[PDB]
Ligand binder design. Structure first.
Ligand SMILES: C#Cc1cccc(CN2CCC3=C(C2)C(=O)N(Cc2ccc(Cl)cc2)C2=NCCN23)c1
Ligand SMILES: C#Cc1cccc(CN2CCC3=C(C2)C(=O)N(Cc2ccc(Cl)cc2)C2=NCCN23)c1
Ligand SMILES: C#Cc1cccc(CN2CCC3=C(C2)C(=O)N(Cc2ccc(Cl)cc2)C2=NCCN23)c1
Ligand SMILES: C#Cc1cccc(CN2CCC3=C(C2)C(=O)N(Cc2ccc(Cl)cc2)C2=NCCN23)c1
Ligand SMILES: C#Cc1cccc(CN2CCC3=C(C2)C(=O)N(Cc2ccc(Cl)cc2)C2=NCCN23)c1
Ligand SMILES: C#Cc1cccc(CN2CCC3=C(C2)C(=O)N(Cc2ccc(Cl)cc2)C2=NCCN23)c1
Ligand SMILES: C#Cc1cccc(CN2CCC3=C(C2)C(=O)N(Cc2ccc(Cl)cc2)C2=NCCN23)c1
Ligand SMILES: C#Cc1cccc(CN2CCC3=C(C2)C(=O)N(Cc2ccc(Cl)cc2)C2=NCCN23)c1
Ligand SMILES: C#Cc1cccc(CN2CCC3=C(C2)C(=O)N(Cc2ccc(Cl)cc2)C2=NCCN23)c1
Ligand SMILES: C#Cc1cccc(CN2CCC3=C(C2)C(=O)N(Cc2ccc(Cl)cc2)C2=NCCN23)c1
Lengths: 174, 174, 173, 173, 173, 174, 174, 173, 175, 175
């Protein structure tokens, strides 16, 4: 990982200085802990300067993704979400959880809300319903529209995602 | 692990200077030794200022969880416990052992006191009864209610765990 | 391992004169524990050292090397058990200074030994353990021998009654 | 496995023709199914002729050993148990479960009723089933069985005879 | 395994009343050797059995199970060592009928034992071996004990002098 | 393994009915037990008819080679040894231990008496001297000539091994 | 492997009844022992009925291949060799070792005399020279022509092999 | 590995500043190179100040242990050897090679000169080098060293003192 | 790796500051590139000052051994070779390749010039003959003598290696 | 890796304008060698650059990337072979600037390519081989047919034979 200088930082530390938090790759408890630590640090530096979440994630552990979601809801800051590459499963929940008006995608990204695939059947569906309710709330779709949509094994383009309510804006340049 | 200026710390060192101790992931002896060392250290800086324990944990080794528990009870400081993600098995014992009035969860966490399925049968039950007595004391439920509940292979929402006495506050914002 | 203020937290512990024995005891754990005991003795021959024990046991000869160093140095040694002290773990707990052997209340202590050398050597080593435990608990050889045959754990108060430790502590005295 | 002629038979088939069932090596569901099939087979050939069970086992899966134990008790035949090598844990339960007066060991065998090492309550429910079985067939009290089982040790055939696990120690026919 | 005239060659050996003990001894080797000894006894209680031993040793309790069966049956047993008889191998060689323990001239014999159970059990097993070896070599316990401490092999003639075997054979007598 | 009619045998059973014993590949205890069983069996069919041992072997376990050797010396039969391919280490000891006048090789075989580089140092040398004495006896070379030759990490042609006394006849045709 | 009937044989046993010996695949000591056993059996059934060796082999252990060669030279029978697929390294030596006039190849086979790639440098070259001398003898080329040719890492077609003297005949139908 | 301050030093660097060289765990070429580098370094700082070698080793590669032995003999410094835990095989050779009067053990250590378990002649040439080294430093005859080394056993520090491997058994400074 | 004292260094760096280069363990291309880098650096610091090479090795890759050899011959510096533990196969070639009069062993070392047992047969012999010519040259023995001693799978003591020409002095203590 | 005075020793070599090509060539080695060559060119596009080669070969496309970078930069490039230069290693050796390609005396050089690459179609493997034929022809000044016949031969050359063939200019013992 390369070093940059004005002051020396490895490049990911330099991104944190810009108020950017990276969510790349599968989400597990360790990624969630490092993402949460950064969200709370950046709020500490300022309650109202926007925070940017870069998402390129195929998904990951549901409870770890919900821990990130709950922290995003908890801090006061506007949070801008940006999808590069893809946002599948828990990645798309975090993308849709950004501050309204500030959820973005680059033009070739792929977005999926279908969930892939130790605990009991009652617990798996309780978690499933929590996802149904988060998605309904942030997309402004009905529970039934969410449930039928998550049953489809397929990706959407940024513009379909925009029309469904996961995203507000599709980019190309600044 | 990103670096943050304040004066250059990795972000987990910065959490500790905020008096936050992280309990993420399975508990084993090496997790316990690190958590204990940090609790004693924060006590030595100040025996009055509260300490905050952040818990996202599926449980782990019982004796190592009991070492953390005993240290929490030993130090003078008030201890605020916070659940994000999940607090299951020993994770939820540590959450319930926070200072009364100061046990919290974020809204989408999942809490389980049922214990997961080399020592003798007498020893396994002796440990199990040590857990029954700890949970009964911090929830103020009777031993028989703790015993029947832990037989249920379940998971509870934050609001149920509040009513049961595992925690005090379910918060969404500051 | 976090950094405190510059100091990684385990080096800060050593600055308090705390030596940690967490986990299976083998030769390199023993080499590090011994290095630390001799270092702390050279800082002050008389100031107490604190040994934090959370351990399932380990290699007998490595255990006896730590034991021999503990008896060698001039310092008083406070032992503290958290979590557990099983097998060689509990030998090191029992070997602290008379009056300064402690446990927190939910610890489990065991002196039974779990199940390459000849049979005569295994028995010689076993009798060295019987003699060490008899000396520091003040029990007879026969009592130690019969107790070590029972595959069970003791609570802190029962270990206190048997003579493995002196005090079960809930809060700071 | 060599063949013996009389008709051609592998040697283990010859033994079963002798009314001998072998319980060798760890007990698991597979072993239990084969042992049970053989006990039931021999009963259907005659529910009066004795059945011989040859045991050389370190033990194994408790529920699999209980399945064999129950079948032994269910069939009408007298059952002679013979210990060669060792009978440890479930091994020694099956040996002690033979028909009274018909439980034997060769002279250099080792016998252990200590058990080695699913939810905590279920582990003790199973252990209680073993205490009740050992008490019934040895005629010791429950308290004597429990103390004996926490001792991590083997017995000689003569000690196991005194305790009630066996009736006879042999040398020759 | 070739076929001779119908008979695989190892079954033809059993027809000569030869039982092979080749290789590490474990519980299934012992179960097969015992099955064969009892089979051959039922063919003729009095006809000699021949035991071919080429073995580095193995599990002690499995070894003692074969030993106990050898002493149990009525038959005389000729032991023959080819290649080697180490540890439990050499116990079974020494345990043949007095006068009928043999070796070919380039065999190596060892009674030293190589280097999960408690230390007391390992010593009990070791003393059972001392008593077996003392009985069949006619040496005192002290002599057996000192010899087993030496990590070395003996030639056939030295094993003959020590009492492990009776005859070193080059050609058919 | 093909089957041949004569009355249906696999071809290795047919070799045995011709009084041929195969010693192919590394020698270990299980090879030795099978070779010994066949030598005794062929002796029991007839103590006078020659037995033929076919050897293509890089050597193997010393004690197992010595068991075969001792059996060869024990039985009454003349034994013809034949080397094709190679006879190295214990393989070449068995070749040299054939009945005098009846040791052969095919033309392109390679023969080595040098020994390849858990027991004590005294035991390893005791075994080594047992081999020195066996080779000296069947080649009728002196102990010191056998000792220096075996130090040479070499391989010899059939004609050299004839001159050294390892074998008697090098044949191309009947 | 399927069974055929007039009399039941697995198909490879039926091939042996036709006096066909298969050398397929890499040549090691085990293949050589089974090939040798069959060559000697078939001579036993008849001293002068031709034997057929089918070769599709990338090569293998040199000493094991020389053991097969020496047996082919030893038996009295005419031996017809047939190459299908390929004959590389030791496979091509066995192909060229057939009775003159009776070495054949199907039209798409590939033939290589280049040798691919524990013993000392002196031994590797002694073996190499044995191959040089066998190839020179059966191809009627000079040692120098063989040595320079084996240095070329390349396959020949059946007709080049015919012209070089490895083969006598290239087929297409009976 | 914790840091100690005076300047920052990992604890093993602090020990070397004390003129202490650690020989822990198996001896191989890597360990030997580091030990040798340290002995030579300490000599260059002073060829008179004693060097202390702390040994807790089951042994290891003979030639690597001989490299250390030769360096120990080569440097001019007095060398104090200290055994904690165990000194077995090459371990015990290095312990016995300390400067006379300066060879120590803690009280519960175990010491073995039996060696555990390339061409046969070369294995004995090496073993002969070890016999000569042990005879020189213990002052026993070659015949006494050879018989002692074939016994598969450990000695206590007091026995090893009688034999000439050590001079002093300690408890405290 | 322990640390030693201005300035502080790991002990292997401190060795190089003394002009000591270590060849411990099996010789492969990366060991050779490191030893070579160290030889050429030491030559640039002083072209005339001796370099010391410490050898405890069982041998290794021949071409990598020869690459060290050629560098040792290339530099202007005198090179003292020291054998502790063992110098086998390529290790003993490097030991013999030190400056005449400066090749040493401690007393209990074992020395072996026998080579242990993908390239063609002709290349293996080409490389073996290069080893014969290097050993002949630095021991002052004939080719035939070197060829016959290398067929023997044995080790030499320091004193027989001395008599054979592989080294000059067996030392027990400093001078 | 030892420190010289702070400076790990491989960084000290880069300060001498030496670039090391040790061991097998793959994309990561090529990236690091290219980075170093362009670095040294930016320090001075006239001071010679030194490539040390001890290599059995490696991935063709990654060798060709180094070759093209050597040809692209302006500096004179001296190539030095120690140990061996096989397959893509010998291409790089031969690609140094004329008059400046060297070998130490016991090196082994091979232009035969071993029987690497993602697996590829038959026409692509031959297209690559013909790229290597051309590069070797241009720098050895041999005709394509001599190059082709020579690479068919599975063998190593000595340095003096490599010098006659046009792969290197100078074989040397000392400086
Ligand atoms: C897992 C988790 C989690 C997620 C959302 C909220 C909380 C509640 N927690 C509860 C407690 C708490 C909080 C916030 C806080 O944001 N800060 C300031 C701070 C934090 C981190 C850094 Cl690096 C710098 C500054 C804080 N300083 C003392 C306590 N405290 C948990
Ligand atoms: C395992 C364990 C364990 C758990 C709970 C209590 C104790 C008792 N122990 C007993 C001894 C003791 C203690 C507290 C202590 O809290 N501090 C101050 C300190 C500690 C760590 C750090 Cl990083 C900084 C400051 C202390 N300084 C000397 C001894 N000592 C053990
Ligand atoms: C293995 C071992 C071992 C265990 C217990 C005692 C001894 C004897 N040893 C014997 C020698 C000795 C000793 C003590 C000593 O404690 N110190 C001072 C010192 C040590 C380490 C550190 Cl970090 C700082 C200071 C010491 N300085 C020179 C010699 N020396 C061994
Ligand atoms: C698992 C199990 C099991 C164990 C103990 C008793 C039963 C009850 N069972 C109940 C049913 C039953 C039984 C006996 C039986 O002993 N025999 C005769 C028989 C059995 C086996 C063989 Cl080989 C030959 C003959 C039987 N013939 C039909 C049904 N039947 C189960
Ligand atoms: C484990 C074991 C064991 C070892 C030594 C003796 C005994 C006692 N056992 C005790 C019982 C017993 C025996 C002998 C017996 O030798 N035979 C005859 C028989 C056996 C096998 C074969 Cl193939 C052919 C014939 C026998 N027939 C019914 C019971 N019975 C155990
Ligand atoms: C291991 C071994 C061993 C090696 C060499 C000699 C002996 C002595 N032994 C001693 C005993 C003995 C022998 C020969 C014997 O050759 N035969 C005839 C026989 C054997 C095998 C087969 Cl298939 C067919 C026929 C024999 N029949 C009864 C006993 N017996 C051992
Ligand atoms: C390895 C090998 C080897 C290769 C070439 C020749 C020999 C010499 N050998 C030497 C001895 C010998 C031979 C031939 C022989 O061809 N036959 C007839 C026979 C063989 C096998 C089968 Cl199935 C059927 C018939 C034979 N009958 C007794 C001895 N004998 C070895
Ligand atoms: C392997 C090895 C080996 C073992 C025993 C003696 C020798 C001879 N060698 C011979 C050469 C030699 C020596 C000593 C020396 O002890 N020192 C001083 C020094 C060494 C190391 C450190 Cl870290 C600091 C200072 C020395 N400085 C230059 C040459 N040199 C080898
Ligand atoms: C692989 C290799 C190799 C082996 C033997 C000789 C050469 C020739 N090479 C030829 C080129 C060359 C050389 C020497 C040189 O020794 N130095 C000075 C220097 C080198 C390294 C360090 Cl660390 C410090 C100083 C040098 N500076 C520019 C070119 N150059 C190679
Ligand atoms: C893969 C590749 C590649 C290979 C050969 C040439 C080019 C073209 N490239 C084209 C671009 C380019 C080049 C050269 C350049 O040599 N330098 C100077 C520099 C480079 C590296 C370092 Cl570490 C320090 C200085 C340069 N500075 C900006 C752009 N640039 C590619």
């Amino acid at each position: 990982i390369p070093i940059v200088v004005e002051r020396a930082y490895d490049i990911y530390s330099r991104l944190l200085r810009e108020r950017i938090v990276c969510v790349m790759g599968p989400i597990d408890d360790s990624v969630a802990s490092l993402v949460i630590a950064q969200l709370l640090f950046l709020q500490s530096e300022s309650n109202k300067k926007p925070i940017h979440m870069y998402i390129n994630s195929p998904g990951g552990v549901v409870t770890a993704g919900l821990a990130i979601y709950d922290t995003m809801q908890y801090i006061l800051n506007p949070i801008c979400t940006w999808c590069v590459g893809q946002a599948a499963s828990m990645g798309s929940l975090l993308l849709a959880a950004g501050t309204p008006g500030m959820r973005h995608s680059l033009p070739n990204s792929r977005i999926m809300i279908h969930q892939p695939s130790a605990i009991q059947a009652e617990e798996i569906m309780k978690l499933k319903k929590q996802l149904y309710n988060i998605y309904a709330k942030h997309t402004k779709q009905s529970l039934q529209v969410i449930e039928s949509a998550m049953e489809r094994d397929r990706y959407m383009s940024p513009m379909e995602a925009q029309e469904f309510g996961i995203l507000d804006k599709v980019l190309v340049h600044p």
